[PDB]
Every structure is written in C-alpha cells, then in structure tokens.
Amino acid sequence: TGLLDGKRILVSGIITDSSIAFHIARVAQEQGAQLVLTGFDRLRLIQRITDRLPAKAPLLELDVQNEEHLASLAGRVTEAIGAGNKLDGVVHSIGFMPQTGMGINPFFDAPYADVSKGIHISAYSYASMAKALLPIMNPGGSIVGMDFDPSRAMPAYNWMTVAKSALESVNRFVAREAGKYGVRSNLVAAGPIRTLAMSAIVGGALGEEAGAQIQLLEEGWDQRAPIGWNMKDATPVAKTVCALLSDWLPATTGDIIYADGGAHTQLL
Amino acid sequence: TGLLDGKRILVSGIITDSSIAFHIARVAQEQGAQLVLTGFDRLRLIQRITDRLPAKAPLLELDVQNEEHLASLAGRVTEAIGAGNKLDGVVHSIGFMPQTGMGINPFFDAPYADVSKGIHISAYSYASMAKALLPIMNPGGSIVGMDFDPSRAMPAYNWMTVAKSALESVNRFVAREAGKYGVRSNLVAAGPIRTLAMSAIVGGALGEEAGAQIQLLEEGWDQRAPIGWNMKDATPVAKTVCALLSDWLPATTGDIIYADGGAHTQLL
Amino acid sequence: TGLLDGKRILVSGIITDSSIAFHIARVAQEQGAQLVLTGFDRLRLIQRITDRLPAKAPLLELDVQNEEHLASLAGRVTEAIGAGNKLDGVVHSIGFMPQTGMGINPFFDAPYADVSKGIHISAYSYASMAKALLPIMNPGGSIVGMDFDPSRAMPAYNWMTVAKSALESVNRFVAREAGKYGVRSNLVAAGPIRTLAMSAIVGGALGEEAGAQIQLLEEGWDQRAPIGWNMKDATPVAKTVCALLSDWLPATTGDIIYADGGAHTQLL
Amino acid sequence: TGLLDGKRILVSGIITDSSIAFHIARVAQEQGAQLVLTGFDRLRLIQRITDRLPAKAPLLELDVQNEEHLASLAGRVTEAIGAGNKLDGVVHSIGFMPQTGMGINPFFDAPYADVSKGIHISAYSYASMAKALLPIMNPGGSIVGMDFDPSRAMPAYNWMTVAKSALESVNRFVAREAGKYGVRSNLVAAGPIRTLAMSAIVGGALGEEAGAQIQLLEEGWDQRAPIGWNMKDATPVAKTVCALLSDWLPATTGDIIYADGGAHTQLL
Numbered sequence A, B, C, D: 001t002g003l004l005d006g007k008r009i010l011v012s013g014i015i016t017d018s019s020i021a022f023h024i025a026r027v028a029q030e031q032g033a034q035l036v037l038t039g040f041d042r043l044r045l046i047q048r049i050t051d052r053l054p055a056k057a058p059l060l061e062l063d064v065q066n067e068e069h070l071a072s073l074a075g076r077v078t079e080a081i082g083a084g085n086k087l088d089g090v091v092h093s094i095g096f097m098p099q100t101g102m103g104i105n106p107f108f109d110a111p112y113a114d115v116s117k118g119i120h121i122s123a124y125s126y127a128s129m130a131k132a133l134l135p136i137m138n139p140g141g142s143i144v145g146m147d148f149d150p151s152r153a154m155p156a157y158n159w160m161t162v163a164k165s166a167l168e169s170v171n172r173f174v175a176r177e178a179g180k181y182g183v184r185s186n187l188v189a190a191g192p193i194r195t196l197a198m199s200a201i202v203g204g205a206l207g208e209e210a211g212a213q214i215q216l217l218e219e220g221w222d223q224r225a226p227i228g229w230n231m232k233d234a235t236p237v238a239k240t241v242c243a244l245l246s247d248w249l250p251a252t253t254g255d256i257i258y259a260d261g262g263a264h265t266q267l268l
C-alpha cells in the first residue's frame, strides 16, 4: 500500500506548516507510517501545527543541546510506541546558526561561541540523535538528515555552510555505527526552501542587498536545475526523505542524495 | 500496491538470468510495471531467459552501434506498447569493453579502435538511447543508467573506468536534454556483481595475479561497506533502479546514486 | 637560477602565440629549461611561431592520431636532445573536438565518428604520449596535461566536456604506469583562455546566442573567482604547468591542479 | 635564486623537529624566506627546537583559543619584521582533538565540549589567523593551512576528520576574504606523517587494536600511492607548502593540494 506502511518513524524539526519536517511528516503519514514527533522550545505552537497533520502522532520535547532530553529520548519514545516495539526510521530536520555567523555580519566577525552553538545544533546533534535512538532501532532501519551542499562557498550562508561541511563528515561516521544495527544513515541535500530558516534574509530584515543575494541564488538555482527549482515547494524534498526511509535504497549508506532539481550537476 | 504501478518501462541489457537488467526487470514487474525489453545479438536465447520473468513482455532487437536499430526504436517500441501510449521509464544496462582495454592486458597496449568500441557501447549509447526514446516519453519520466564509480583508478578495470568516467559526463548532459521533456536522467553506481561483466577475471581466465587483484577489491568492498556488500545479489541494485524509476526521487537529475553498500564513503 | 634549470622538457601543442603551450614554453625557457617542441599539421607555420620564443628549441612533427609518429617519437626526441640524455618533463597541451560535438549543434546530433575523433585527440592521446616518452624519461620526471573542469555540465562545451572527463580518468591510470618510472602525471585545470580553441564562439562565428552564452560564462568565472579570472592572460596557467614540472610538488600525482582563480570553489 | 627570496613568512605549529611546520620553516629558510615563528604553551621547548633551524627567526607566542593573543598578534608581527613591512606568507600548521574524539573512544562517546575544542583549534583558528594577519599582508600573498583528506570516513580519526571537513569549508570562505587583499588561501592535504599528532596511536598507547588500525592505513597509503608514501619524511609536504607560498601557483585559491603520494586518486 503506502511506501512506509507499518513503519514506526521519528520525525524531528516541525516548527511551522512550511517546515521541511512538516511535509516529511505529512508525506510519511500519507504513505502509511506511524510517527513519533519531537519539537523544540515553542511546544504549544508545535502541537497546534502537528494537529493539522493527516493523523494523530505523539509530540515529545527535544532540545538537542540538552543532555537530559537525549538521555531520556529512547525511554520516552518506547513509552509512546509501546514496549517491545521499535523504530524503523529517524528524521533529523534540525539546524540553526545565530545571526553573527550567517547573513550580513562579516565572516571573520562571528564569535566561536556562536559558531560552536551552530555546529552543536546542525551537525553534532545528528550523531547525538543516532546515539540515543539506534539502540531502539530495528535492522533494516533508516536515519535521514537534512543537508545543503557545502562543497562550494557562497555569500551570506557563511558558518552554516561550514556546519553543513561538518554534518556531511558526521553522517559518514554515523553510518559506520548504524551499520552494526543494520541501519542506513544518509543526508538529503535540498535546494533553497522558503521556511523559517530563510524568512529573515528573504523578507528584507537584513537589508535590501542581503534579500537580493538570496533571490539571485534562488533564480540561478532554478536556471541550472534541468528539471527546475521552486523554492516554495517542499514536497519534492519530503518525497526524497521518504524514499530513503523506505526499503527501496537498501545499499545506500553514509551518503548524500541530492533533492535540488539537479542544480549541483550544472555550472550554468 | 506496486511502486511502479501503471508505468511503461523499457529495460535493456538482459543477456542471462544473472544480468543486472534481469533483476531490474523482475523487481519492476513485481511492482506492476509494464515492460518492453531490448536485447542484443543472441535474441533466441534472450527470449528463453525473459520467459522466466514474472510476466510476459515484448522483446525488441537493439544494437546501440546499429543506426538502423536506433532510428526504428521509437516506432517499434510504440508498436509494442500501442499507439497513444508513451514510456514512463528507460533503463540503460548496456556496457562492453574489448579484452585489450580490460583485464591483464597492459593499459598502454589498448588499440584506440577497441577503446572507441568500448566508449561507444558503454558511454555514448546512453545519449543515443535517450535521443531515440525521449520523443516517446511522458512528463515525469525517468532514464536510469548503470555505473561503476570511476572517480579513483583501480587495477584491471582500466579503459572501462575511462568509459564510465565519460558516461557520468554524458548523463549530466542527457539530464539537460531530458529536462525539456520533464524527464529525469540518473545513474546507479553499483558495487561489483557476479555477472558476465566479471566472469573471465573472477573465473581465473586472465591469470592468477588478475584474479587475486579482483578478490582483494571484492573483499575490501564488503569490509568498507558499513552495511556490507554481496556480489552474488543484484536485488539491492535492482531496487535502487526502481526507486529512481518511481515518483519518490522527483528532484534528482543529472546525478549518481550509490547502491554500493556505502563502500565509496569509507577509506577503510 | 630558474625553476626548471637544467631540465629537458618536451612541450606539445603550439600552433599560434596565443596557445597555452606557447606560454608554457616561453616561461619554462625563461626558467632555464632545454626544450623539445612538437607540432601538428602545418609545421612551417608552427616553426615561424616558435621562432618568436626566447630560445631556439627543435621542432618535431607529432599527429597523436598517427600510429607511425608515436612509434618513432622517442627515437626522434633522443636524436634531438642527444643520446644518453633523457627528458625530465613532458607537456601535453593537445585537444580537439569537431563542430558537431561542440558549440551550437544539438548534443544528441553529434555522430560517434566525430565524438571518437575528439576523444582520441583530447584523452587517449595523453596515454599514447606517456607510452612513447616514459621509457626516455628520468626518475623525478613530470607529465603535465591541460584540462577544463568537467565535474559539472555546461552549455556549448558538450562532447569536449565528456572528453575532459575521459582525460581525467586517463591521467589517473597514467600516474600508475608513470610511477614505475618515478614520474608524476597531473592535469592543470585552467579557466577559459582566448586561444584558437575558443576564437569561433568568441568571435561570433556561431551567432549571437552562442556568443552571449560564452560571455556569461567568462563574466561569471571572473565573478566567482576570489582572485579574479583574465581570459586574455595565459601566464598564470603556464606558471602552474611549470610548478608541476619542477621538484616543488614532489608528492602530487594522478591529480588535478586548478589554475582557475578559485572559480570552481565558489557557487557565486 | 631561492624560490622564496625576500618573502616575509609567518610560520605557526612548531612543537618538535618532527613537526610538519618545522620542515616548512626549514625549507622556507633554505629558499631565502625571512621568517617569524609562532609557538604555543611549551615556548621554552619550541625555542630550543627553532634554534636548530638554518637561521635565527623571532618566536612570538600564539594560543589560537586566546582572544588577547589574536588581537595583539598583528602589532607584535609588525614589531618583529619592521615598521612599514607586511607579510608575504602565513602558514597555519595548527591542529588538536582530545582523546574522547580521537583514538579508541567510541565516536558517540565524544562530549561536545571536546569536539568543540578540537573544531576551534583545527578549523575555526584558520579564519582567526587570517582575520588577524590579512590586514598586514602584501598583495600576491599566500595563506596555507594543513589538511588530512576528510571526504571519506576511516577508523580512529573520528572527530578530527569532522574538524578537517570543517577546515576545508573555512578555507573556501577565507579565500573570499583574502581575495580582497590580493591574497590566495589554500590547504595542503598530506598523507600520514610520524609527528606528535600520531605518536600515541603508532606507539601502542591506545592498545593493539588502535595500533593495528594505523598500521593498515599507513601500509595502504603507501601501496595506493603510484609514486609511494613515506610517513617518516615531511620534506615533500614542506616543499609543497613552499610551492603554494611562492609565485608559481598564482591562479589557485580556496583550494586543496594533495601531497599524499597520489593515494587519494587510487582505490587500490
């Protein structure tokens, strides 16, 4: 029936209805998956958003910078899905970089405290999540993370591109660990998407120039992409994550699957 | 329901029940795809082999080097699927390299006549097949080709590695043409599989040093791979082709997916 | 004392004074190298160009497609540099792709005959050259080839990009064969340069659309390049070839050195 | 004529005579470079070590984790080379990762505080150094960092690989900043060298398992290398850094140059 029919998947990262994790959770539910969701900080707002999903799914609090939340994760998840029952999928749609290391502040000027917070959330946490959830994962299982091609440097992205470079390395190692459990670990490298991750720069909140630079990136992304790129559509990226959570890419681990319209394969 | 339900797919490259294409065809038929099969040279024998598939499919002759075969291909494929109906998928599982450019023969002792023969069949033919079948493809279609990671040089593979490097470049350009049709173009880079592509070197036909060279590569592949690698199992590769033929990787084009157990992501 | 002082280098690829090879030859000679030059087709015309070099260097005929020129090459070089004397360096600055495979002809409309000729001259010839000169090369030696980054597809380059992909793979295997002689084999991936290789598309011989598209590429290259890119200055490329010909990159082989202003490291 | 005649070069990262930076400093001096050295913690040790170098050079103190050191560095460098004089080269041979992130400790057991210390010292400090030293750098200058290929996961290295992956990214953005000063920024990706960076794992201090892992890697590195690899000789690496500090690679920036024997270019 569904692509993930009878699968128990954990989906992290829903904040708004435009969050990549929301469309991942939506497509996953449409494809028969039973979900457990994790949210950070504004939990009464996340509960309101996740209520708009095709189905009821338990919401658990998880700050990946909180040692206690990580220590109790597996326990709280098992309680949510029933004892003796395990996870088949894990979705890491978590990331952040403070305004000093991303946007208009000069690259050099970002303090290591802010860069460190950014690497802990967007890169180190991918391993943190796998450490906590892998002992409650079933053989054949899948851990998918969200990436943004960091092989080439670009304007404004700055220390987020550095944190993504680190995430890619982490993923490669997580795969070594996950393989002992019969679990795959991969990243989906998406093109730009109009979520909370971009809303300040796009909305002219960092100035007119900053907004212009992103619009050139989104325009150029669409040009290069042989099959086009709609920065307003999160569903192609959502579908890709669901391909990796399914049993249809069973010899793929420690890798990057590009869901970007084909932009990264083209120069112009 | 089936992953490729209601999809019309052409599958090329079946020569034995062990061929990568045989597994792609069987898996696709299991997932409700209506196939058309192209075969080369020994067709009376290909029909005997294709009769072993889960369902009956039309068998057409196609020599990628015969221009009459290529020019008639769309018309002949149409005749088989019926007028008004178009293809939703194309599988290119065709490769060849003369003995002078592959195995024990010294890399410098390969006549260009033979390297050109190998590049025509292994690389150029991917653009030829796309040229012929793109006019009879439906928007959202998928063209998948078979790859063996040529990013690093290896013993024995020699000019076949060169042919594969040319192929990755062809794929990137086919994606550009295919995009105009709303069609995706990708390659599945597989790990070594015990087909007729490897039978001579493996069966000790190119001497001891050549067979030992392969064994070391083969062993190293399975140990590098975080989830392992089985040369005697084409099913994980076959599932990956089907994953790309499906609607679940809709933002991936001009790209390479690695169905290699994750081996290319590890040094040791 | 010069960077290539007392070195015997063979430099191929001079046709006009705008050629990359001419600049490689000028600088190498400026750096104390003893040269042996190889030209193709119109050698009386090439001799009138090589007369404009800082020093007198013997000129030898070499059509890379001519099986007799390669079989007799090493003998002609030894006769030119003196018996008992060996080459310390070799420069491959050869490339060609017919009008059907490059420019405004549809990528699909290139006949294999024409593609094969361009692959013979631009990739296979690098291996032909090394087969010929490795036996008359000194340990510590250096074979350098010219490349144009083929990792990402682009407009108008078409089958030349496919041949540059083939070349990259060929170099990797050449480094294997060369290492048995203590010789390094590498590619210098240069950005675009105003030579006879680009003069038609730059000059409008291919129409407005074509011209506009190459200008866009040039503009963007210099934009992306953190140190800038001047398509009218072959000197930084020549200097890079000389660096690989020296003993200053002694642990680098089967590789690509980018002399492109850093363009390939920047998305925009 | 020395390759670096009259070039005021800052060299960081000396601790012993086996340190990569010591050999970089030695060759730079052998090549007529005027040096300013930077040392950390054990400054009496570094002084005794630098006294063995070909010439007398000022040794300044720099802990990359200390903001006072970084802010004062530029003025202290000016004082050393002379008023009205700027640097022509800057060498970053600094790196560190605690035992929790490197060795036998499981990848999932490395606390973020430690991973963060490693990334601070190994990746972030490259930007810090450039931030401080670019305003006292001359046009045509070079910033060179030390790297160890992080594109593939491997045993033991774990989080240092994650840090190197981040360093590559930082270098790519440093090139964007340096380009404004007419300065190139690059990394030398070396193969493994018997320095203090490896001495614990090679010496058997992390047990048999860990020791055997390095043994396999070191042996594998030499067999993959077409020109070979000797981990007891840093001079080829040292030369390569000097090649990047010179005017012979003037079109290369935001890049990685592999002084690894060509090991990264071969699978076997």
Ligand SMILES: NC(=O)c1ccc[n+]([C@@H]2O[C@H](COP(=O)([O-])OP(=O)(O)OC[C@H]3O[C@@H](n4cnc5c(N)ncnc54)[C@H](O)[C@@H]3O)[C@@H](O)[C@H]2O)c1
Residues within 6 Å of the ligand: A012, A013, A014, A015, A016, A018, A019, A020, A021, A039, A040, A062, A063, A064, A065, A092, A093, A094, A095, A096, A121, A122, A146, A147, A148, A189, A190, A191, A192, A193, A194, A195, A196, A197, A198
């Ligand atoms: N939008 C894009 O252009 C784009 C492109 C490629 C990749 N991505 C990545 O996709 C992922 C999802 O981002 P998005 O674009 O949907 O933005 P988003 O802000 O909608 O989602 C990111 C999530 O990260 C969460 N988060 C932040 N700090 C956290 C902490 N300490 N603990 C737990 N969760 C925390 C936020 O609450 C939010 O739910 C991120 O990794 C992002 O880098 C985004």
Ligand SMILES: NC(=O)c1ccc[n+]([C@@H]2O[C@H](COP(=O)([O-])OP(=O)(O)OC[C@H]3O[C@@H](n4cnc5c(N)ncnc54)[C@H](O)[C@@H]3O)[C@@H](O)[C@H]2O)c1
Residues within 6 Å of the ligand: B012, B013, B014, B015, B016, B018, B019, B020, B021, B039, B040, B062, B063, B064, B065, B092, B093, B094, B095, B096, B121, B146, B147, B148, B189, B190, B191, B192, B193, B194, B195, B196, B197, B198
């Ligand atoms: N098994 C491996 O080691 C391996 C690994 C990665 C990729 N591949 C690729 O997968 C594909 C399928 O190979 P396989 O491993 O199943 O072995 P195979 O020998 O069964 O497949 C090769 C196919 O190409 C066909 N062919 C050869 N010349 C042709 C021509 N002129 N016209 C039309 N068809 C022609 C053959 O008849 C055969 O069916 C090839 O492209 C191969 O390079 C193989």
Ligand SMILES: NC(=O)c1ccc[n+]([C@@H]2O[C@H](COP(=O)([O-])OP(=O)(O)OC[C@H]3O[C@@H](n4cnc5c(N)ncnc54)[C@H](O)[C@@H]3O)[C@@H](O)[C@H]2O)c1
Residues within 6 Å of the ligand: C013, C014, C015, C016, C018, C019, C020, C021, C039, C040, C062, C063, C064, C065, C092, C093, C094, C095, C096, C121, C122, C146, C147, C148, C189, C190, C191, C192, C193, C194, C195, C196, C197, C198
């Ligand atoms: N100009 C650029 O933008 C650019 C960029 C990157 C790489 N390159 C490469 O540099 C190399 C030199 O090209 P160039 O830019 O100096 O232009 P060019 O056209 O002046 O030089 C190419 C040389 O290749 C020679 N050649 C062609 N067919 C031959 C054959 N059968 N045998 C022997 N020699 C033959 C030509 O006679 C010519 O001397 C080529 O490999 C080219 O692909 C050029």
Ligand SMILES: NC(=O)c1ccc[n+]([C@@H]2O[C@H](COP(=O)([O-])OP(=O)(O)OC[C@H]3O[C@@H](n4cnc5c(N)ncnc54)[C@H](O)[C@@H]3O)[C@@H](O)[C@H]2O)c1
Residues within 6 Å of the ligand: D013, D014, D015, D016, D018, D019, D020, D021, D039, D040, D062, D063, D064, D065, D092, D093, D094, D095, D096, D121, D146, D147, D148, D189, D190, D191, D192, D193, D194, D195, D196, D197, D198
């Ligand atoms: N030997 C290898 O296997 C290898 C391979 C590739 C790259 N490298 C790199 O080469 C560089 C030098 O390493 P090495 O092999 O010479 O070993 P090393 O231990 O001699 O060098 C590390 C240096 O970093 C300095 N350092 C450490 N912490 C610091 C801090 N907080 N502030 C300032 N300086 C600090 C020390 O003075 C020390 O000299 C490093 O970046 C290393 O990662 C080493």
Ligand SMILES: CCNC(=O)[C@@H]1C[C@@H](NC(=O)c2cc(CC)nn2C)CN1C(=O)c1coc2ccccc12
Residues within 6 Å of the ligand: A094, A095, A096, A097, A098, A102, A103, A104, A148, A156, A157, A160, A196, A197, A198, A199, A200, A201, A202, A206
């Ligand atoms: C609610 C207002 N949102 C913001 O401020 C967000 C939060 C933060 N995004 C993130 O962490 C973030 C970015 C990404 C994409 C890889 N994946 N993630 C989680 C930055 N940012 C912006 O808009 C931008 C400001 O400079 C930019 C430069 C490039 C792209 C976005 C912004």
Ligand SMILES: CCNC(=O)[C@@H]1C[C@@H](NC(=O)c2cc(CC)nn2C)CN1C(=O)c1coc2ccccc12
Residues within 6 Å of the ligand: B094, B095, B096, B097, B098, B102, B103, B104, B148, B155, B156, B157, B160, B196, B197, B198, B199, B200, B201, B202, B206
């Ligand atoms: C039935 C007789 N088989 C053979 O001779 C086959 C046919 C031919 N393979 C092919 O073209 C071929 C190889 C591949 C894998 C990428 N994909 N394809 C179509 C060569 N080869 C061998 O075994 C080998 C001889 O050296 C080798 C070195 C490495 C691998 C195989 C052989």
Ligand SMILES: CCNC(=O)[C@@H]1C[C@@H](NC(=O)c2cc(CC)nn2C)CN1C(=O)c1coc2ccccc12
Residues within 6 Å of the ligand: C094, C095, C096, C097, C098, C102, C103, C104, C148, C156, C157, C160, C196, C197, C198, C199, C200, C201, C202, C206
């Ligand atoms: C003398 C008149 N010039 C030409 O016709 C040359 C000869 C031929 N170049 C070559 O083989 C050639 C090209 C390159 C660069 C990698 N390296 N090499 C030897 C094509 N070409 C052109 O201008 C172009 C026509 O479409 C183009 C698209 C892109 C770039 C150039 C042209």
Ligand SMILES: CCNC(=O)[C@@H]1C[C@@H](NC(=O)c2cc(CC)nn2C)CN1C(=O)c1coc2ccccc12
Residues within 6 Å of the ligand: D094, D095, D096, D097, D098, D099, D102, D103, D104, D148, D156, D157, D160, D196, D197, D198, D199, D200, D201, D202, D206
């Ligand atoms: C003082 C005795 N040596 C040590 O303890 C050193 C110091 C520290 N290495 C470093 O920071 C370090 C390592 C490297 C190479 C990229 N570049 N750098 C700055 C760890 N380490 C070891 O030997 C190793 C322990 O597991 C290992 C696994 C692989 C390689 C070395 C060790």
